[PDB]
Nucleic acid binder design. Sequence first.
DNA 1: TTTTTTTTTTTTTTTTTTTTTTTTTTTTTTTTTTTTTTTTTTTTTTTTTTTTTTTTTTTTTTTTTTTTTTTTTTTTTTTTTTTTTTTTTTTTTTTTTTTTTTTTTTTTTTTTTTTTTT
Length: 49
Amino acid sequence: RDESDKDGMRIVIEVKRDAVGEVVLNNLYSQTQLQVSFGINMVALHHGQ
DNA sequence: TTTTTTTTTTTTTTTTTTTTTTTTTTTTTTTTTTTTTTTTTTTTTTTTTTTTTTTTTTTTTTTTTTTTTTTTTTTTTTTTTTTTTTTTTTTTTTTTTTTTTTTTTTTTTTTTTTTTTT
């Protein structure tokens, strides 16, 4: 669920009793978009080229 | 300090219902085949004076079988009633006009990541 109320940004992800929790967070980083790779490419017009 | 009662969401998987992929039948649609209309010219058909020997109508009289005729009893005709179809008032619904309130989609271009197939 979400619990954002203009005092931050809260997304609660409840963990089951039979689960480590840290392993779930590592899986979420690996699979989900919580970790994203920003591909830097510094191209700009210098002297109009 | 140990032990006892109750509460719910999950191990759930199966029954019921819903949703989503399917393909028989009457209504469209493109094709070929047969009805219509306008020109050329063409031997061919067809319109109109003259003569002619014909063959059917009008003097007159005759009869007979269709035109006179009266009457019995049928039976088509007309009357009432009711059903079926046609046709027109009535109602309903939908569309367009011009200023208002709201929205919703398809593609380029590069680079990086997921997400399936081999």
